Ligand binder design. Sequence first.
Ligand SMILES: [Cu+2]
Ligand SMILES: [Cu+2]
Ligand SMILES: [Cu+2]
Ligand SMILES: [Cu+2]
Lengths: 118, 118
Amino acid sequence: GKRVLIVDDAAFMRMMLKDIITKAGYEVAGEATNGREAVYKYKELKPDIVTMKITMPEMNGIDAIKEIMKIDPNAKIIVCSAMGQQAMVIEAIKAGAKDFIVKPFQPSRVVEALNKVS
Amino acid sequence: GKRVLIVDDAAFMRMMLKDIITKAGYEVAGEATNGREAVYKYKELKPDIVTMKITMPEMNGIDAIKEIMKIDPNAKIIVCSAMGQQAMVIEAIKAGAKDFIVKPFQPSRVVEALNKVS
Ligand SMILES: [Cu+2]
Ligand SMILES: [Cu+2]
Ligand SMILES: [Cu+2]
Ligand SMILES: [Cu+2]
């Protein structure tokens, strides 16, 4: 599955992600900026993969992951984290996330996380 | 029409071009970098729109417009020009191009032309 839902607080982080993943042959299905928009674009876009940032306004990433799996037990979520967010990454993996990339990431490091999950 | 074939020599100009047009609700049907790729790819992607740069390594923008016009007489081509390329621009309009953008890009100016060819 080539179609990615990019969910991120920061515009600069959505753009890089758009640019790395579409370079690696993935289709950006769409984007979102908080946890509430994330779950809605997901029902809408039925993406194969989701990249989810933890720290976001209104609804944080782990709450987005939780709702997304109750909605779809088979989602494939990669969490985007900062250094020092290791505990939160764990709660993400606990809540369903299949893997994680960390900011600032190596473009190969983002591509293989994508590849490992499909 | 939402799907644009962006054909430019320089990657900086395409991603930028891709960034603006995808921000305006147009979807990058694809991209190209010389006139020969411009004309295969166009049969292939059947794009509604093409943004074509004039000076290409070895198929220049103008002959791509001519070839593309024999292929599809109702194509909608926007040529990308540098400052001082008014002569080359005219031959494009002369050869079929519907409109033109100029570098350094004005976002409202780029969005305006695209809509005009609707
Ligand atoms: Cu809606
Ligand atoms: Cu909607
Ligand atoms: Cu991020
Ligand atoms: Cu970009």
